[PDB]
């Protein structure tokens, strides 16, 4: 098991919020692009980044990848449900439970980024990131779509100085 497995696992688990959000936006007829990258949130991200002593611009870049990867899952769900509406989940999403999960996963990701900051700047980061994703792909049984989302969501983990 790799040193970055805990950050990648938290990122993969966070990707899973795409299924519940997709379910609500489909029935609510809401745009997937209106997804919260707005000034107040960007400020709030950067402040919690300074509070953990990590570079906000790095952290901002990570969540920018995270949002692109999550929008991608939601778009893929929408295609599937256009092709075949009956494969949509029959159960409504638990958004209130998702809120608490996102708060916790957000916090775990930031605390891991500080805890492992030294490694993310080292030349061996890329090799460690591969091992982490390869482990997380196996342990969470990620399908092809989530594997790609994980790659997009972590593609700038090692862009750290």
């Amino acid at each position: 098991t790799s040193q970055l497995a805990e950050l990648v696992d938290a990122a993969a688990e966070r990707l899973e919020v795409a299924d519940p959000v997709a379910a609500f936006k489909w029935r609510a007829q809401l745009p997937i692009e209106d997804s919260g990258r707005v000034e107040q949130q960007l400020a709030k991200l950067g402040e919690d980044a300074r509070s953990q002593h990590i570079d906000p611009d790095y952290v901002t870049r990570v969540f920018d990848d995270q949002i692109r990867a999550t929008e991608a899952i939601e778009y893929s769900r929408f295609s599937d449900w256009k092709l075949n509406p009956a494969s949509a989940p029959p159960e409504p999403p638990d958004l209130s439970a998702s809120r608490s999960a996102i708060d916790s996963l957000n916090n775990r990701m930031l605390s891991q980024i500080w805890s492992h900051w030294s490694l993310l700047s080292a030349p061996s980061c890329a090799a460690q990131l591969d091992r982490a994703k390869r482990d997380i792909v196996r342990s969470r049984h990620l399908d092809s779509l989530y594997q790609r989302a994980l790659t997009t969501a972590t593609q700038s983990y090692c862009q750290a100085l």
């Binding site: 997804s35 996102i102 708060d103």
Partner: peptide, 13 residues
Amino acid sequence: YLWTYYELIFKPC
């Protein structure tokens, strides 16, 4: 709207 960029934020329409 329903946001996910940093916080899961939900406003009923």
